């Protein structure tokens, strides 16, 4: 496929134009009716909203400016918006609008009613290998796309993968995403998904995303992650030992792929070798995978979330609701000028 190579070069050109001249201020708060909280965090939350003029539903991420500054997450938050407004791929949640007011930053994303892979995985227990492979292929293509733009994702986990109406994956949460050529050092991610080099503070590159994919595939197929414990420190100890045990039901091909992704030695890890992503795409475990058909979304999904209207929130957990405050005074104006 010289196809992929020319798709990616054209993709980079579109990305670079938007990266260099980002869109800003494309809606305002009173154009949306807020319906229900879909998730929370230490400096913000995500709400289901309805856009009054179209009637469309969106997921609106609301960030408290003062809290973002206090917790020293300015660069990460600016990274998120700048990257989101510039990318475009079948398996990435789309940013539809963004704006800010006196108190908050807002990113209005497409709403994916099927809920997080997390909920479905815990409920079902584990996914069959073809089911896990279907999702894994989507992540492979998405990381190929992101890494080609010099982006590192850094927060792969089932909680950040939404299942759409066609049963396909939509990756959300670009809060730790960064455009970087060369090494970076920020200790971020989720404990169970951190690569050894992050934990050991040595500097790391995009190979950490491929390690995380190994953890994700293991967790989808097993129903539990390869390294778990009640405290992060004990999890880290297991991760850096790199000893992995596999369930009895894992196929030989799956175990071999995972030995190569969950390789503690950076320089031997699939995705990070001479042939790059092709080592993964060409692996026996993916022999049945039609990569083009996946990209084109022509493969029949193994699972479709039950759907009862746009606006249905049954696939999401209940959260405690709270006011959206907008101060009469502008907060942190200079810090977020480019947002």
């Amino acid at each position: 496929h010289h196809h992929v190579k020319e798709f990616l070069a054209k993709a980079k050109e579109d990305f670079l134009k938007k990266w260099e001249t980002p869109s800003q201020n494309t809606a305002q708060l009173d154009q949306f009716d807020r319906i229900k909280t879909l998730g929370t965090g230490s400096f913000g939350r995500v709400m289901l909203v309805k856009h009054k003029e179209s009637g469309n539903h969106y997921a609106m991420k609301i960030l408290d400016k003062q809290k973002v500054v206090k917790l020293k997450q300015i660069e990460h938050t600016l990274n998120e918006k700048r990257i989101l407004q510039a990318v475009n791929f079948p398996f990435l949640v789309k940013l539809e609008f963004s704006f800010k007011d006196n108190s908050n930053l807002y990113m209005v994303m497409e709403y994916v009613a099927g809920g997080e892979m997390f909920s479905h995985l815990r409920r079902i227990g584990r996914f069959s290998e073809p089911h896990a492979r279907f999702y894994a292929a989507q992540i492979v293509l998405t990381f190929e796309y992101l890494h080609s733009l010099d982006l590192i994702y850094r927060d792969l986990k089932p909680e950040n993968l939404l299942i759409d109406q066609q049963g396909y994956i939509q990756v959300t949460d670009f809060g730790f995403a960064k455009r970087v050529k060369g090494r970076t050092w920020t200790l971020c991610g989720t404990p169970e998904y951190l690569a050894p080099e992050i934990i050991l503070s040595k500097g790391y590159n995009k190979a950490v995303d491929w390690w995380a994919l190994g953890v994700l595939i293991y967790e989808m197929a097993a129903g539990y992650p390869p390294f778990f414990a009640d405290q992060p420190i004990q999890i880290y100890e297991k991760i850096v030992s790199g000893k992995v045990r596999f369930p009895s039901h894992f196929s030989s091909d799956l175990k071999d792929l995972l030995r190569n992704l969950l390789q503690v030695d950076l320089t031997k890890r699939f995705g990070n070798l001479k042939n790059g992503v092709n080592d993964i795409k060409n692996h026996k475990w993916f022999a049945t995978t039609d990569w083009i058909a996946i990209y084109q979304r022509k493969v029949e999904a193994p699972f479709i979330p039950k759907f009862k209207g746009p606006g249905d929130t049954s696939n999401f957990d209940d959260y405690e609701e709270e006011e959206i405050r907008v101060s009469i005074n502008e907060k942190c104006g200079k810090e977020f000028t480019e947002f």
């Binding site: 965090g41 997450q73 990460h76 997080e116 997390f118 815990r122 927060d155 986990k157 909680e159 949460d173 809060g175 730790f176 920020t186 200790l187 971020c188 991610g189 989720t190 404990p191 169970e192 097993a222 129903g223 539990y224 992650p225 778990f228 414990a229 009640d230 992060p232 045990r245 369930p247 957990d317």
Partner: peptide
């Protein structure tokens, strides 16, 4: 079993991201 140990553990719910 490993599964039973996981399910009895404190980390079966949605996992918070960290930065540090």
């Amino acid at each position: 079993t490993t599964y039973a140990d996981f399910i009895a553990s404190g980390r079966t719910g949605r996992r918070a991201s960290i930065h540090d």
